[PDB]
Amino acid sequence: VLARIFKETELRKLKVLGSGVFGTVHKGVWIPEGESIKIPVCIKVIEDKQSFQAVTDHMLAIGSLDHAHIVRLLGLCPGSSLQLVTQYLPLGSLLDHVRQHRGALGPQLLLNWGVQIAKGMYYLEEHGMVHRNLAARNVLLKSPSQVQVADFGVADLLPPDDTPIKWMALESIHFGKYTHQSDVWSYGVTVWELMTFGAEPYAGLRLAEVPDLLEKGERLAQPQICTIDVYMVMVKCWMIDENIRPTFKELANEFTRMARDPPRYLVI
């Protein structure tokens, strides 16, 4: 239960990669202990929109976590803006990956990722950490076959302020309430994104409408490559009652069970 603090003079930003809802991610280098060294790192810049001088208890909570399937926060740099420092993964997003390669991907390989994501979210659930922004953009490739959940708990760094709405559980939209169960919903839309080779969820619809549609219980369409067995996994994630939504434990089970005989549960 500790997080490393990085002196400002240790970090250097080379290039910007992009920016999401809360921050701005920069490709950078890390130079520790005066003597020259060059460690490739990713630096995410988060600002209030008051100061980030001072470490909160939640910042340490993020800092402590370490799992084979999550993106570990190597360190933290306070200042006017908060600088979150992680390792740089050249292979990038799972979302942009499935788009580019699509169905060419292994039906076996694509199932393993469902398992690998669930294992990570389990690790987060275990240490009582609510991700609050799970999505395909947030799942990253550490290795051609290996993925890691990124961007956990960033949302809880900033005061309640206001599109992740396509990834939120209905009670999160209605009550601004986030649980481990609410992320389970987000896991659902995620898996969906994958099975659709990176299709945009609720495409070409108005955001105001979105609460209505899933409330009417029409929900997401069945992805082209998914058998009813894999599709129902997702459907249980979007059940209005959270206490009937599956745990990440069970989700790791159902996918690994399907992973034994890959083409039975998915098809080109």
Ligand SMILES: Nc1ncnc2c1ncn2[C@@H]1O[C@H](COP(=O)(O)OP(=O)(O)NP(=O)(O)O)[C@@H](O)[C@H]1O
């Ligand atoms: N460790 C990393 N290595 C390489 N690229 C990264 C890393 N972390 C984030 N990125 C990329 O940086 C870009 C911007 O990140 P971010 O500010 O989180 O926005 P986002 O992930 O697109 N959406 P959101 O997470 O909802 O803000 C995205 O294209 C990420 O894939």
Ligand SMILES: [Mg+2]
């Ligand atoms: Mg992100």
